[PDB]
Design an enzyme around this catalytic site. Structure first.
Site, PDB file in Angstrom:
ATOM      1  N   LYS A  51       0.837  -1.108  -0.100  1.00 36.49           N
ATOM      2  CA  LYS A  51       0.094  -0.073   0.023  1.00 36.49           C
ATOM      3  C   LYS A  51       0.914   1.254  -0.139  1.00 36.49           C
ATOM      4  O   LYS A  51       0.256   2.140  -0.406  1.00 36.49           O
ATOM      5  CB  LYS A  51      -0.755  -0.172   1.196  1.00 36.49           C
ATOM      6  N   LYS A  63      -6.488  -7.590  -0.129  1.00 35.25           N
ATOM      7  CA  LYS A  63      -6.589  -8.518  -0.861  1.00 35.25           C
ATOM      8  C   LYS A  63      -5.279  -9.192  -0.976  1.00 35.25           C
ATOM      9  O   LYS A  63      -4.924 -10.381  -1.044  1.00 35.25           O
ATOM     10  CB  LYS A  63      -6.942  -8.164  -2.470  1.00 35.25           C
ATOM     11  N   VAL A  94     -11.570 -13.971 -27.802  1.00 35.24           N
ATOM     12  CA  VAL A  94     -11.585 -14.102 -29.169  1.00 35.24           C
ATOM     13  C   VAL A  94     -11.349 -12.606 -29.661  1.00 35.24           C
ATOM     14  O   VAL A  94     -12.207 -11.705 -29.140  1.00 35.24           O
ATOM     15  CB  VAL A  94     -12.901 -14.737 -29.833  1.00 35.24           C
ATOM     16  N   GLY A 180       3.574 -10.191 -28.302  1.00 35.00           N
ATOM     17  CA  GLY A 180       2.169 -10.635 -28.611  1.00 35.00           C
ATOM     18  C   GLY A 180       1.905 -10.504 -29.897  1.00 35.00           C
ATOM     19  O   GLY A 180       1.082 -11.293 -30.534  1.00 35.00           O
TER      20      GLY A 180
HETATM   21  N1  GFH Z   1      -2.374   5.926 -25.592  1.00 32.57           N
HETATM   22  C1  GFH Z   1      -2.564   4.536 -25.619  1.00 32.57           C
HETATM   23  N2  GFH Z   1      -1.828   3.563 -26.265  1.00 32.57           N
HETATM   24  C2  GFH Z   1      -2.070   2.236 -26.401  1.00 32.57           C
HETATM   25  C3  GFH Z   1      -3.021   1.698 -25.815  1.00 32.57           C
HETATM   26  N3  GFH Z   1      -3.114   0.202 -26.113  1.00 32.57           N
HETATM   27  C4  GFH Z   1      -2.040   0.244 -26.916  1.00 32.57           C
HETATM   28  N4  GFH Z   1      -1.367   1.203 -27.051  1.00 32.57           N
HETATM   29  C5  GFH Z   1      -0.215   1.361 -27.877  1.00 32.57           C
HETATM   30  C6  GFH Z   1       1.165   1.070 -27.015  1.00 32.57           C
HETATM   31  C7  GFH Z   1       1.642  -0.195 -27.600  1.00 32.57           C
HETATM   32  O1  GFH Z   1       2.677  -0.548 -27.061  1.00 32.57           O
HETATM   33  C8  GFH Z   1       1.232  -0.093 -28.896  1.00 32.57           C
HETATM   34  C9  GFH Z   1       0.944  -1.491 -29.365  1.00 32.57           C
HETATM   35  O2  GFH Z   1      -0.262  -2.050 -28.773  1.00 32.57           O
HETATM   36  P1  GFH Z   1       0.134  -3.686 -28.610  1.00 32.57           P
HETATM   37  O3  GFH Z   1      -1.333  -4.269 -27.804  1.00 32.57           O
HETATM   38  O4  GFH Z   1       0.609  -4.360 -29.416  1.00 32.57           O
HETATM   39  O5  GFH Z   1       0.929  -3.390 -26.902  1.00 32.57           O
HETATM   40  P2  GFH Z   1       2.340  -3.811 -26.855  1.00 32.57           P
HETATM   41  O6  GFH Z   1       3.353  -3.009 -26.211  1.00 32.57           O
HETATM   42  O7  GFH Z   1       3.325  -4.084 -28.212  1.00 32.57           O
HETATM   43  C10 GFH Z   1       2.399  -5.513 -26.060  1.00 32.57           C
HETATM   44  F1  GFH Z   1       3.403  -5.467 -25.263  1.00 32.57           F
HETATM   45  P3  GFH Z   1       2.586  -6.875 -27.168  1.00 32.57           P
HETATM   46  O8  GFH Z   1       1.633  -6.410 -28.543  1.00 32.57           O
HETATM   47  O9  GFH Z   1       4.015  -7.296 -27.153  1.00 32.57           O
HETATM   48  O10 GFH Z   1       1.465  -7.757 -26.571  1.00 32.57           O
HETATM   49  O11 GFH Z   1       0.231   0.846 -29.064  1.00 32.57           O
HETATM   50  C11 GFH Z   1      -4.050   2.701 -25.177  1.00 32.57           C
HETATM   51  O12 GFH Z   1      -5.194   1.911 -24.506  1.00 32.57           O
HETATM   52  N5  GFH Z   1      -3.819   3.805 -24.887  1.00 32.57           N
HETATM   53 NA    NA Z   2     -11.583 -10.189 -27.448  1.00 36.31          NA
HETATM   54 NA    NA Z   3      -0.879   3.489  -1.954  1.00 38.57          NA
END
Ligand code: GFH
Ligand code: NA
Ligand code: NA
Ligand code: CL
Ligand code: CL
Ligand code: CL
Ligand code: MG
Ligand code: NA
EC number: 2.7.7.7
Length: 326
Positions: A51, A63, A94, A180
């Site tokens: 915390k 938790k 999915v 990913g």
């Molecule tokens: N501002 C904002 N940016 C977002 C958001 N979601 C994804 N992004 C951004 C930054 C990512 O790295 C990028 C790619 O989106 P991503 O889902 O491929 O994330 P990632 O960093 O590549 C994961 F680690 P991985 O793909 O390896 O599982 O796009 C969001 O909710 N808000």
């Molecule tokens: Na989904």
């Molecule tokens: Na805190």
DNA sequence: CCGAACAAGCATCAGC
DNA sequence: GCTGATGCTT
DNA sequence: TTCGG
């Protein structure tokens, strides 16, 4: 992973609130706490210790006390016993099925992978491809395959027009040993904040990667964002590689540094960074950083010629991609 | 005690 | 057709 | 669910 047990629990809780409860703020709360605990460099011995971290409040602290004493969380064990919660959570895995469609499918008795497969007529295009490759999309990508995919993408983009610049971002640009998916930032000098001189700039790249059979499927696609599927080509008699999600973002060339900041992430890093920008008096998106007025109206874009200019503006020390994995 | 909590492209639908 | 709100995703 | 004011 010093606190891997605690961070799994919190991630599982965040997924529950998102998929089942549709409580986006609880979901962000658990995810932020899981991220601040993942980087905490000690093995947490109590919820009170935890915390002390920002993002861990009273409820998450107790938790963590429950988990540390018993190795389990009763709340999660009940959620696992509940059929409707288990089914909604599963269906949301999915691609293209979110909490709304998942709960609606469950209402119609569509509830398992086989349920989905026998009801493809009930899926939109995106969901149909997410079900198609459901197994593949849950496998990670070794960095050695990201390197082969990178080399294909950059070289095919070069053949379309030597002036394209393709940058692989996401966890790959953050140096991750597995990803990913593949995230590709695309610029071309004909597409700036001021003008779009050539049409179909993204299309032409998609078409070229489809024609060399790298891109296999399309989930969604507009003038600036492609979301789809790719597959490395395999050697004679080798077994196929899994299919992989690929995202391509065409960004105005003069706005690359904001674009590459955005697309390198992580998503939580982006949230933390854009939140702090607001506190400092700025708004950041993937195009610009702008000052906010007293009212709360974005002013004009500020000049930017590196990623670190953006950090400077909000008064953060520059953090290399590798240190943005929140 | 209460408001804020990042920002936005694409697919889809309702309403005109 | 267009606009605007929602879902889903990054 | 947590935080700041
Ligand atoms: N501002 C904002 N940016 C977002 C958001 N979601 C994804 N992004 C951004 C930054 C990512 O790295 C990028 C790619 O989106 P991503 O889902 O491929 O994330 P990632 O960093 O590549 C994961 F680690 P991985 O793909 O390896 O599982 O796009 C969001 O909710 N808000
Ligand atoms: Na989904
Ligand atoms: Na805190
Ligand atoms: Cl909520
Ligand atoms: Cl548990
Ligand atoms: Cl903008
Ligand atoms: Mg990615
Ligand atoms: Na992605």
């Amino acid at each position: 992973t010093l606190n891997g047990g605690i961070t799994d629990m919190l991630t599982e809780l965040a997924n529950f609130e998102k998929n089942v409860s549709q409580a986006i703020h609880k979901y962000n709360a658990y995810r932020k706490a899981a991220s601040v605990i993942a980087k905490y460099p000690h093995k947490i011995k109590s919820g009170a210790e935890a915390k002390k971290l920002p993002g861990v409040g009273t409820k998450i602290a107790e938790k963590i006390d429950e988990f540390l004493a018993t190795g389990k969380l009763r709340k999660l064990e009940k959620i696992r016993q509940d059929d409707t919660s288990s089914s909604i959570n599963f269906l949301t895995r999915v691609s293209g099925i979110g909490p709304s469609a998942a709960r609606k499918f469950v209402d119609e008795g569509i509830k398992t992978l086989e349920d989905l497969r026998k009801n493809e007529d009930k899926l939109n295009h995106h969901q149909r491809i997410g079900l198609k490759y459901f197994g593949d999309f849950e496998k990670r990508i070794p960095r050695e395959e990201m390197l082969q995919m990178q080399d294909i993408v950059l070289n095919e983009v070069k053949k379309v027009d030597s002036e394209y610049i393709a940058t692989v971002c996401g966890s790959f640009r953050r140096g991750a040993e597995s990803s990913g998916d593949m995230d590709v930032l695309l610029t071309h000098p004909s597409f700036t904040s001021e003008s779009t001189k050539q049409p179909k700039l993204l299309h032409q790249v998609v078409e070229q990667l489809q024609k060399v059979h790298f891109i296999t499927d399309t989930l969604s696609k507009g003038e600036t964002k492609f979301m789809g599927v790719c597959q490395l080509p395999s050697k004679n008699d080798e077994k196929e590689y899994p299919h992989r999600r690929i995202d391509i973002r065409l960004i105005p060339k003069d706005q690359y540094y904001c674009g590459v900041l955005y697309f390198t992430g992580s998503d939580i890093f982006n949230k933390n960074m854009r939140a702090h920008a607001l506190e400092m008096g700025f708004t950041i998106n993937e195009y610009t950083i702008r000052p906010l007025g007293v009212t709360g109206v974005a002013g004009e874009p500020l000049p930017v010629d590196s990623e670190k200019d953006i950090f400077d503006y909000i008064q953060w020390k520059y953090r290399e991609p590798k240190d943005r994995s929140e």
